[PDB]
């Protein structure tokens, strides 16, 4: 459900 972004 979370969209992918860099930490």
């Amino acid at each position: 459900a979370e969209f992918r972004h860099d930490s």
Partner: antibody
Amino acid sequence: QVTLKESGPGILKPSQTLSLTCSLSGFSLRTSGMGVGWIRQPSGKGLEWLAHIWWDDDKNYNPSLKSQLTISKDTSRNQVFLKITSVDTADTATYYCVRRAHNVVLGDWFAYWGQGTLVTVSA
Amino acid sequence: DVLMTQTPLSLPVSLGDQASISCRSSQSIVHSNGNTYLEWYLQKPGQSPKLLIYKVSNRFSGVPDRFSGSGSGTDFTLKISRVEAEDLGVYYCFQGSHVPLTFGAGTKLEIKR
């Protein structure tokens, strides 16, 4: 020098299959963390996100339309494609493909939009 | 699906007036990486949308600083201190935290008379 240009049929009938293309330049979705995606908008109405493809072939879809959508890519001829199957009058809309990275440097946002292309699903 | 409820859907203003737009997620949109991917977009007639604000309060390059975004978590806001002709158009707030990515309905910035 960074641009996105959408190509479409213009028009096609219901229960047929839409094939869209997006010509990238001034960048590669080859590069790490890069991605390109599609967002459409019916005449005079809201913006609906459809799908996004990542450099590593990771793909994301709208649950509403999980069966109809099919995003793909082509790294060195530098293009990204989407197809909607069994289309209908409600799929008539302007389709934008936009750029977005998943890292803070290439620009994690929809900064760059193409001018768009009109697909109208009519019998 | 995180619905984004912009209010009002239409905002009549005068030229050079203060103007504000509420945007409220149904749920939190703070991504586990810590960021809040709440963006604001302007679409003028016949044009594709344009990024104004990202991560809630960060103004995009070239955007005049009379645009500001404020908020946290769920309650978000876009303000324009002195509204001008070119600002007129439709404003969409947007979340890129939770798939499916969603926009609000769109607050049309139209003039009053």
